[PDB]
Amino acid sequence: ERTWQDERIYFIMVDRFNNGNPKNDYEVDVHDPKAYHGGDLQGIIDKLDYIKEMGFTAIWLTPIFANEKGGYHGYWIEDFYKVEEHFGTLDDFKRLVKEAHKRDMKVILDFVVNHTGYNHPWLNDPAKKDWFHEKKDIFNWANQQEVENGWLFGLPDLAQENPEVKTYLFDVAKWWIQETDIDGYRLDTVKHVPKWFWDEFAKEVKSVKQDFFLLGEVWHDDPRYVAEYGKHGIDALIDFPFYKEASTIFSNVDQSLEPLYNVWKRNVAFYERPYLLGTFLDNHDTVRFTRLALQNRINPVTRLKLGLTYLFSAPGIPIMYYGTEIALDGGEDPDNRRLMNFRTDKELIDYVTKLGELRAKLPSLRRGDFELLYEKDGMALFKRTYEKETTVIAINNTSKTQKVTLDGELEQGKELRGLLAGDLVRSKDGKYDIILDRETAEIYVLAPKTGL
Ligand SMILES: [Ca+2]
Ligand SMILES: [Ca+2]
Ligand SMILES: [Ca+2]
Ligand SMILES: [Ca+2]
């Protein structure tokens, strides 16, 4: 039976994904990178089969709550109880969950507790002036109390210390769960809100749906700092240490994959739940991974194949940003948030589809241990075992044909059947001679010998 370790997440910025209703396009302007561009909830419903067909088992939507002007991303909330008018109606959103659930797919909403939009009405309500912390910037980022109390980017910082604010937040969190049947929240700006609040928050949402899933965003590349949050009722965290390594390493050839395995060992070290760490190559707050490839003047398609191979075969919960499967280019926000294009070449859509199939099929990729057998200068071999399954992930991130002989690391007299590109490596005298041509990848299941 299904666990969050088994999940593959397709991540969507609602506005930037699929304009499925042309009639809710209010002052949409696709030529202003800070306006609404037209994507909506109808948009997403129409693309459920496309998403599911790729092997994705869950969708994370950027926030859907009514936002003030310029809130095309959803993070400057104006009304916690209202669906953003450009996206749809509440009904449209209930139908979306229904449509995902029909497809066996889970729905995660982005959910914000830290702050309101800049022009939220409460800012004017005299009864609510103690709803907000004193307006101050964050200066010492090493002062965690300052980080929790400051107004990030000048965003009205909610005061969770006030029981009225806390209650309001729990009541909205519980409400969307009881009203729409979502499966989880991706928690924005986790690090700007105090830990004691997450414990209570955690208690409050799971009191309403027992398996309610929480994926927290703690923006930091120190797993020691990120891992603490996991101790406060948050089931999974976004793995920025993974991202920082994966992004850099897979965007150019002849770079060692070894740092990624140390991110693993450190995840085992520091987190209670090392498999429930959301892994990615990019997201809506980062430069597009394709732009890192373009910067290094190297073909982004071949970069993406290697990266996504590792993403889909390593521990954690893969989170592919909409667009990755078309080599969508994009610099810094907002330029990383381009309209999805559905009429491009399908090479990476089919490659991703194979990957998600293999991660579905091969419970060693969702649940197995994770061993580094070999790493030189980008040529890497990993091994993963689960019950009677043993899998071997080979990624040649080097500019040369590589041959690596395994000799005791696998049980002798079998063969490795390459399930990603059709390779075959037969034990010959205990040894497996793994040969990969430059910048290719393979995923092998270890299996009984065959022949003519
Ligand atoms: Ca629309
Ligand atoms: Ca609005
Ligand atoms: Ca705060
Ligand atoms: Ca080495």
Numbering used by the authors: 26 to 477
Give verbatim lines from the article:
α-Amylases (EC 3.2.1.1) cleave α-1,4-glycosidic bonds of carbohydrates and oligosaccharides; Hence, these amylolytic enzymes are employed for industrial starch liquefaction and saccharification. GH13 family enzymes have three structural domains: (i) domain A, which forms an N-terminal (β/α)8 fold (TIM barrel) that functions as the catalytic domain; (ii) domain B, which is essential for substrate binding; and (iii) domain C, which forms a β-sandwich designated as a putative saccharide binding site6. Here, we present the first α-amylase structure from Anoxybacillus in the unaffiliated GH13 subfamily. The overall structure resembles previously solved structures of GH13 α-amylases13 and consists of three domains: catalytic domain A containing the active site within its TIM barrel fold (residues 26–139, 187–393), domain B (residues 140–186), and domain C with an all-β fold (residues 394–475).
To complement the understanding of enzyme conformations before and after substrate binding, we solved TASKA structures in the apo form and complexed with maltose or maltotriose. In the absence of a substrate or product, the structure of TASKA-Apo reveals that the active site of the enzyme is occupied by water and solvent molecules, whereas the structures of TASKA-M and TASKA-T show maltose bound to substrate-interacting subsites −1 and −2 of the substrate binding site with each subsite able to interact with one glucose subunit of maltose. In the TASKA-M and TASKA-T complex structures, the O1′, O2′, and O3′ atoms of maltose were positioned identically to three of the water molecules in the TASKA-Apo structure, and the O5′, O6′, and O3 of maltose were coordinated similarly to the oxygen atoms of the acetate ions. The water and acetate molecules interact with the conserved maltose-binding residues R211, D310, D213, and R362. Although GTA contains only two Ca2+ binding sites and shows high sequence identity to TASKA, we identified four Ca2+ ions (Ca1–4 in subsequent sections) in the TASKA-Apo, TASKA-M, and TASKA-T structures. Ca3 is coordinated by the side chains of E109 and E110, the main-chain oxygen atom of N92, and three water molecules in TASKA-Apo and TASKA-T, whereas this Ca2+ ion is coordinated by residues E109 and N92 and five water molecules in TASKA-M. Ca4 was coordinated by the main-chain oxygen atom of E400 and five water molecules (TASKA-Apo) or six water molecules (TASKA-M and TASKA-T), with one forming hydrogen bond interactions with conserved residues E283 and E400. Structural superposition of TASKA-Apo with TASKA-M and TASKA-T using protein backbone Cα atoms shows low RMSD values of 0.32 and 0.20 Å, respectively, indicating that the overall structure of TASKA does not undergo significant conformational changes upon maltose binding.
